Amino acid sequence: YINDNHYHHIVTPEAISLALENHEFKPWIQPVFCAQTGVLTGCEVLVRWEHPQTGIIPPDQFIPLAESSGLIVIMTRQLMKQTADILMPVKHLLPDNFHIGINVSAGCFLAAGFEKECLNLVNKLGNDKIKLVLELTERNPIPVTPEARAIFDSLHQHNITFALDDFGTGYATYRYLQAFPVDFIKIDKSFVQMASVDEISGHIVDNIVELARKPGLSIVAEGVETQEQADLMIGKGVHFLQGYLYSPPVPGNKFISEWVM
């Protein structure tokens, strides 16, 4: 197969490792809002691989290998460090209780020192100023063990919150949530985008919302692209919106320039 393509380069573990040495994995930041008020409540940090001069490589090109290789652990550590570096100078300008969402893979969660790196980020930005939200995914789940539950529960006891990027409402999902009782349910962008278009996807979004219908739980919808989608989500009792409608992810300096100043 001959492909007319000058920008695809087979991603190898050694390419990821060198890129980590060169600090090429950068946190882009997408704002998150209260319902349809337009009030900024927080953000999500999203990795992009900025490789000279291929350009800005999206995570679907490298995260699966970063996870299988284990290099994701260093990557996430770097992302949390850089997030602190970006926001520390302007922490006083953030709204009180600004939420910061970081994606956490099973390998990162289980790695020695994980909680310490989370608490370091929080302490740098202010424990009484921001709220860290660790985003878990059903895509590749943390095995349920008492050790893993102790990590989860300790983080919960040290002022950190969790979200689940949720895709299903089957038995395994409920079992996972019993082990790891998250604070937020996230409706994946893949379903939000189809809700108004595909009737099945609409039912699945409804099923996911019903998951969060319990005391103390709230919901974020990501991938909100249109006013119709945003309307639909708030009307279902979705608390927080994120998406291209408001802003795509942007580099750190632009996030500060556009949303903090």
From Swiss-Prot:
Any GO molecular function: cyclic-guanylate-specific phosphodiesterase activity
Keyword set, alphabetical order: c-di-GMP, DNA-binding, Hydrolase, Magnesium, Manganese, Metal-binding, Transcription, Transcription regulation
Cofactor: Mg(2+); Mn(2+)
Any one Gene Ontology cellular component term annotated for this protein: plasma membrane
Induction (free text): Autoregulated. Directly regulates its own expression in a c-di-GMP-dependent manner.
pH influence on activity: Optimum pH is 9.35.
Residues reported in the UniProt entry to bind Mg(2+): E44, N103, E135, D165
Stretches assigned to the EAL domain: 9-261
Subunit note: Is in a fast thermodynamic monomer-homodimer equilibrium. Dimerization is required for PDE activity. Dimerization affinity is increased about 100-fold upon substrate binding.
Entry protein name: Cyclic di-GMP phosphodiesterase PdeL
Native organism: Escherichia coli (strain K12)
